[PDB]
């Protein structure tokens, strides 16, 4: 949890870098901004790589993406 | 639970989770209304406090701001605000299939140049509004320590959200004033490069005027006739070089 | 098309006594209707054995429409008609009040009667005259029935009565 | 926060300072100026006497090097090799090239998420002292690895 | 458009007792309707174990409009239809008054009667004739119900009954 | 356009007891309305634990106008429906009169009855025969309710009921 | 009842999907190595079309009617312009959603209920597993089909049995009014879609060594 | 107050300020039926005196 631990401690958050600053002159390994250079290799959600989910709903549990695809793996089957 | 969900469902088949279901469902039927209230008050408090901090910080750095954004030095010889120019580079357009449009450079006039009286400083672009709100009316209250601490952490979330929202507004305003100044300096550059028509003003003036009940000494009328705009006869363009 | 007299399930979460009819709710949780719900009331019984739910207004979301199927309730996994609650609420209070007032009346009159063959006379006094008014009040209020109450967390099964489209 | 990572994975800079102190306690030179990092290793602690063969004890040291090197998000790692003067010029050049090749190959087999590994060895062209007593005993015969920490 | 029979939240703030019916207002705090206000009333039950609320006059802010959805409420966090208040107001008072007047009647008549087999005579006097009129007045006023009271500081949850536009 | 269900504050300055209804004028002072006058009268509750004023005749100066908003009252400093008054006006009077008349009746009859087993006989006389007419008069006048009275020095608050233009 | 079976089917589908996406992500580099597209793109950033070839086909139209063909060729999707190479992530990456709702109505109370709970849950679980694998194999079949059609176009163009795409571009200098200008104008159009040829002389026979 | 409004909101999450909501109800009405009258009579006396 302690990001700049075992040093002087947290200086401040450089939002140009999106990084914390340790009290000695070394970069932390945590972040403070959501505009940060972070590797993203796993995602949630449905209708990805499509138009997204439709805001309208079906009477049944069928879910239809915005580009016309229908995802059974998000939908409920019988 | 439902993660290793064969084991999860066989574990939820046990009766201790079933008797713990009774206490958690009655809580889950209603409790979410406090979260919206906590988020609302956290947003209010964080937005107000961060606004006060940034206004104080902006006031602290007054002199170099007027040093860098000298609108007063930028005006033309007839007290004329320069127009606003935008330049876009290497534009591809895909209007549809089977038809592509390509250009390398293009220029747009956004605000037509006009008259002015005073140089517009930075305070109408960057100064943030502040009020002091002294009315927290929280109708919902916690009862025990659990709702107390989730109230605290949701207020923390609203506090951080308000701070982020204020910073977003600041970024939008500073981008706005930067692009307006960029348009002005681009106009100066292109008029130097002889790519646009300079603004042109005619004037007439009459001597004394009026009847024996009202007079002015000398009456000067100044009217601008030629708005600055780009030329299309590009073969008369003057190039540049450096050293 | 929802078939006539089929079986579904919902959850009743509104606890209400069998004393005042009013709007009560359930929401259909499984089957074809998910997100659909059903409001209505209850009915009072003649005796102390059951309670049935007057459910008449069914709603399915999405469009500004409301169907009008009215149907009643069945016991989840027991296939009965009663309510799982207490019924022994108000027998013992009225019985004890009646017996106490009667015993008091008798104590005063007979222990005044057997005086031929201070505080004992005061006992005669007290039971004598507080027996009678309490006894006629007990005869006034004895007829109150023992009620039933649905619970705040009891799910239920549903039989159908008519169809919609 | 429950869906976003609070830090870069496998990061404990307390342990990084600990292993950096332990590396300098070993005597392998750790140099940190700016965002450019330098690690220097004596060649006698790595190879045999003017040989392109890894000593079998040195793989533990190599694992320590890779455990340090996996920490920092990087782009490019440069490997330079230096030697003494033994027989001719191209002999020393070839030996340095082979040594740097071997350490680069094992490291690129290991999990350091660079995009670029550059390797070169130059023999005895840039000495770090005038003290030329031994052969591979002399500290100028060495392997340096440099990089720039990015963002 | 609001789904027929869904649940929302409000907080009631009016202070009133269940003896004089009057307009009561609540205010929706979250969800889609914010700052919407709701005016209605109550009604009295046959037995004093609960309190249910009439709510029919809904005003949505923004425009000069007033809808007329007539819908009722449920108690949050215990999921019943009652009121959290006090109900033990008028049991012990009427019971004690009746019993005291009766005991007075009995003391005067029987302690005068048992003289065959001054201050004590004055005790006979006092209880003998203050018992009777107080006893019939207690018989008159015995039927007063135990009230409940709404609070000026309690939130609540509201279900719907019919549809709007 | 005043929206439905808001709060304003005013001043009541007249004194009237809850016995004779009459025109009382309160003065709306704050919010949008300043100098507005409001003529109305009160109501009698069934039980005297609170008091509200029926206020309907609301007028604003400036133009010769009088709107017809009728609304009710909320307590300054309490936001309840009661009144700043006492309630103990008519308990002790009737109870003491009844008990004294009854004790007189008992004294005369029982101290005449206990003679078998001059001035004391005159005590018997006095309590004996002034008891009875006083007792039936007390039975006649016992039904007087405990009153309340408004203050000629207490302001008020107002909740709204319907809108205006 | 069957509710435990159905919700176990949902849970098994989700868990198999999550593990599948994990494995598919972890094997990363060879995937985009073998499914290149930008090496296969045409001259003008044109995605080349897709072709289907069938061999030795017989149709019985009805009682006493038959047709025999040797090789049939069909253009599936017409070629068009593009701004990016398509990648496999819009073909293979399955969706994922954690199912957080076990409906707490039919919790077991007796051991026989626990037994039927267990057995119905596991058979629903294996149903969800097999359904997810069916989805995955349908996706891999369709992307294999796309790439096969593209490379078959490439070798038909090698064998001189399809017309190449044809493009004309028009060029203008500065345009527009005095307020909006563009330095150049390049209008890039395609007139002739690539298509098959019908004559007999232009067939280019192949050989090997 | 509201500078440390995190701490202030924690204090109002605590129930010690809940009883403070009652004691602010009494003084928030009676003063406002007095302040404008006091200001008006002060204005009248001051205007006459200064005139």
Automatic annotation (TrEMBL), chains C, E, F:
It comes from the Bacteria. Coiled coil: none annotated. It is found in: Membrane. Belongs to the TrbI/VirB10 family. This is IcmE protein. It comes from Legionella pneumophila. The lineage of its organism: Bacteria, Pseudomonadati, Pseudomonadota, Gammaproteobacteria, Legionellales.
TrEMBL record, chain D:
Keywords: Membrane. Residues 34-151 form the OmpA-like domain. GO terms for cellular component: membrane. This is LphA (DotK). It comes from Legionella pneumophila. The gene is lphA. The chain holds residues 38 to 188 of 189 of the full protein.
Automatic annotation (TrEMBL), chain G:
Keywords: Signal. It comes from the Bacteria. This is DotC. It comes from Legionella pneumophila. The gene is dotC.
Automatic annotation (TrEMBL), chain H:
This is DotC. The chain holds residues 26 to 76 of 303 of the full protein.
